[PDB]
Design a protein around this nucleic acid. Structure first.
Ligand SMILES: O=c1ccn([C@H]2C[C@H](O)[C@@H](COP(=O)(O)NP(=O)(O)OP(=O)(O)O)O2)c(=O)[nH]1
Ligand SMILES: [Cl-]
Ligand SMILES: [Cl-]
Ligand SMILES: [Cl-]
Ligand SMILES: [Cl-]
Ligand SMILES: [Cl-]
Ligand SMILES: [Mg+2]
Ligand SMILES: [Mg+2]
Ligand code: NA
Ligand code: NA
Length: 326
DNA sequence: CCGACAGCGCATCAGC
DNA sequence: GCTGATGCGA
DNA sequence: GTCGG
């Protein structure tokens, strides 16, 4: 939080470019800068100082000087006063409503939480659940609760088949004291890059979690990725816990390490690592790390037996999960 | 300058 | 029904 | 918006 003021500004700018301008690259440019500045171990005294960092160019350097001097950014001050921008930014906060649907809804006069509620009919399934739990999905999950949730998930999974391995990844695995949601990497020996000897592997787990009333709603669901909602059980006379978002990813067991690396993130860390990979001549996804031929075409999967092996291929020293929070 | 910017699963749609 | 483009989110 | 060649 040394440069909290500056990172918030850059984040707001990023959200504006993504939600309103629908300019994704500007979105990522701003996020990269906020990220590199978030880890800068000094209290930034000037844009020039910030420009030293990779990701911070002339435009952001100027904005930082304006922020350090006045404590604000006129450009943002103006964005905040624009109704269309305010409405669009707001609507995108509903899970399932992106920049397009948000701008679309505004054209139709649907601009507030109140409007969304009297217009459920105009929403798809995902947007409907997002609206339903709008408030809850805003709340962070104390790690203490993450521990309880982990307990339930691992124990319920074990009950379906002792051969399943469920690993909580995301910010939890990185040691965060609070998480935005719970991310679970799932594996089962029957499902490998070689074959799927058992269908419904993801379904069965979802089913079991719904049975014990842990999973309450489903945003989306396929053979390998589940996007849903869950809730910790509460005691008698005790107020109910907020509903939580839960993501589950079923990955071939022989590709666990590439899968655990991906799902542990962060997303910016993954973006930096994959980009670095390309430069070194490799391509990395959640399943494998492949070399890039002279043509650019990816080759065959390289042997991987630990997260570290992936780091070695691209000539990167190993970084513990707790240090991948970019 | 100018092309590149990480990679991909699920939902939904147009075109056939 | 299929396939491919697009939105959305991870 | 920023970067590398
Ligand atoms: O754009 C994305 C989003 C997510 N991911 C990966 C990394 C991230 O850590 C993981 C889980 O996604 P979340 O959106 O749940 N983020 P995370 O768990 O890191 O943080 P939070 O506490 O917000 O959930 O998926 C990407 O690679 N790219
Ligand atoms: Cl852009
Ligand atoms: Cl401001
Ligand atoms: Cl692997
Ligand atoms: Cl692959
Ligand atoms: Cl995912
Ligand atoms: Mg998460
Ligand atoms: Mg998640
Ligand atoms: Na710089
Ligand atoms: Na949204």
């Amino acid at each position: 939080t040394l440069n909290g003021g500056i990172t918030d500004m850059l984040t707001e700018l990023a959200n504006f470019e993504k939600n309103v301008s629908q300019a994704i690259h500007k979105y990522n440019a701003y996020r990269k800068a906020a990220s590199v500045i978030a880890k800068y171990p000094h209290k930034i005294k000037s844009g020039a100082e910030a420009k030293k960092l990779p990701g911070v160019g002339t435009k952001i350097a100027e904005k930082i000087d304006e922020f350090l001097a006045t404590g604000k950014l006129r450009k943002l001050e103006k964005i905040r006063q624009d109704d269309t921008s305010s409405s669009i930014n707001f609507l995108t906060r509903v899970s399932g409503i992106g920049p397009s649907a948000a701008r679309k809804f505004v054209d139709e006069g649907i601009k507030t939480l109140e409007d969304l509620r009297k217009n459920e009919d105009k929403l798809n399934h995902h947007q409907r659940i997002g609206l339903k739990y709008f408030g809850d999905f805003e709340k962070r999950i104390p790690r203490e609760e993450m521990l309880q949730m982990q307990d339930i998930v691992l124990n319920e999974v074990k009950k379906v088949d002792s051969e399943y391995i469920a690993t909580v990844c995301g910010s939890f695995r990185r040691g965060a004291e609070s998480s935005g949601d719970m991310d679970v990497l799932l594996t089962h020996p029957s499902f490998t890059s070689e074959s799927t000897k058992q269908p419904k592997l993801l379904h069965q787990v979802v089913e079991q979690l719904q049975k014990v009333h842990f999973i309450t709603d489903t945003l989306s669901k396929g053979e390998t990725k589940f996007m849903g909602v869950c809730q910790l059980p509460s005691k008698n006379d005790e107020k109910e816990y907020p509903h939580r978002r839960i993501d589950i990813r079923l990955i071939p067991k022989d590709q666990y390490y590439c899968g655990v690396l991906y799902f542990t993130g962060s997303d910016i860390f993954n973006k930096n690592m994959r980009a670095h990979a390309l430069e070194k001549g490799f391509t990395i996804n959640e399943y494998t790390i492949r070399p890039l031929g002279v043509t650019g075409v990816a080759g065959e999967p390289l042997p991987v037996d630990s997260e570290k092996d992936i780091f070695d291929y691209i000539q990167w020293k190993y970084r513990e999960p707790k240090d991948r929070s970019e």
